Amino acid sequence: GTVALNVVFEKIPENESADVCRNISVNVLDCDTIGQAKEKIFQAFLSKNGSPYGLQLNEIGLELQMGTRQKELLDIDSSSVILEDGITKLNTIGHYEISNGSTIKVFKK
Amino acid sequence: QGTVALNVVFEKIPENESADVCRNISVNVLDCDTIGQAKEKIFQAFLSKNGSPYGLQLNEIGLELQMGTRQKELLDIDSSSVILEDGITKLNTIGHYEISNGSTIKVFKK
């Protein structure tokens, strides 16, 4: 199960130029964790621009755009599923009911 | 999340209430459900159908996917699991094993 995201990257000085492409469609799987999605998003930026975004994965966040609302997407938050033995299941894209074409903003933490 | 209908077959065991229990049940799971989650759903569905539980604990049973000729055990962690960014292992899901609607899953006493 695959979903195509409309990803918008925050403009930071850590980018190579001010000419880099910042609006990119990125496919992820419904069962990818938020961390796995962040990796694909970083990879797509690099594949498009020939230069990295510039920050570490842990220096950036993802925000889902829902109409007037902003929602941060994390591997673990207050909405996470606690499993059988008390283990917390890592949040996935599917956990957040993110649809084809949903806008995700990559922002500096 | 996508739904997967599993054709579940339960092993007849003496811990069942009677020999008349229904042991062939269609059970939905979600492709992102861990194998542990999938197991809870399978027990629940047994209970909803039969009015009695299977009789064992989740740690006392296993699931095997019937792959035409092959039989493949479904586990939360195995040698096929995905190791994530920080060294952390991602628990296996239904979708990790590429399980298709109508696949046969055998519940067996470990």
Q: The tokens of A100 are what?
A: 């084809």
Order of strands, sheet of A69-73, starting from the edge strand that comes earlier in the sequence: A23-29, A2-9, A103-108, A60-66, A69-73
N residues, chain A: 109
DSSP state of B34: B
Would you say A57 and A35 are in contact if contact means Cβ atoms under 8 Å apart? yes
Q: How distant is the Cα of B64 from the closest Cα of chain A, in angstroms?
A: 20
CB contact (8 A) between residue B1 and residue A89: no
Q: Whole-angstrom Cα distance, residue A56 to residue B6?
A: 41
Cβ count within 10 A of residue A43 = 13
**CB neighbours of B2 closer than 8 A, spacing ≥ 6?**
A1, A30, B30, B31, B95
For A31, nearest residue in chain B (alpha carbons):
B32
Would you say A102 and A71 are in contact if contact means Cβ atoms under 8 Å apart? no
Q: B54-57: which pairs have CB atoms within 8 A and are 24 or more residues apart?
A: B54/B10, B54/B13, B54/B15, B54/B16, B54/B107, B55/B13, B55/B15, B55/B16, B55/B17, B56/B13, B56/B15, B56/B109
Beta strand extents in chain A (DSSP E only): 2-9, 23-29, 60-66, 69-73, 103-108
CB contact (8 A) between residue B95 and residue A35: no
Cβ count within 10 A of residue B51 = 9
- Between β-strands A2-9 and B104-109, what pairing exists: parallel, antiparallel or unpaired? unpaired
Q: Is B23 helix (H, G, I), strand (E, B) or coil?
A: coil
Would you say B40 and A40 are in contact if contact means Cβ atoms under 8 Å apart? no
Radius of gyration of chain B (CA): 14
**CB neighbours of A29 closer than 8 A, spacing ≥ 6?**
A1, A2, A3, A36, A93, B95
Provide the domain limits for residue B70: 1-110
Look up residue A70 and give its amino acid.
Q
- Number of A–B residue contacts, CB under 8 Å: 42
Q: Whole-angstrom Cα distance, residue B76 to residue B92?
A: 5
Number of domains forming the structure of chain B: 1
Which residues face A15 on adjacent strands?
none
How deeply is A81 buried, as exposed, middle or buried, from its count of CB atoms within 10 A (0-12, 13-18, 19+)? middle
CATH number of the domain enclosing A95: 3.10.20.90
Q: The tokens of B23 are what?
A: 């042991």
This structure was determined by X-ray
CB contact burial B5-29 (16+ within 10 A = b; e otherwise): ebebbbeebeebeeeebebebebeb
H/E run at residue A45: helix A34-49
Q: The tokens of A40 are what?
A: 């694909």
Would you say B38 and B54 are in contact if contact means Cβ atoms under 8 Å apart? no
Report residue A77 CA to chain centroid gap.
15
Which residues of chain B are within 8 Å of residue A35 when distances are taken between CB atoms?
84-85
Distances (CA, A) of A25 to A10, A41, A90, B47: 15, 9, 24, 45
CA neighbor of A34 nearest in space, from B2, B75, B37, B85: B85
CA neighbor of A20 nearest in space, from A31, A11, A29: A11
For B93, nearest residue in chain A (alpha carbons):
A31
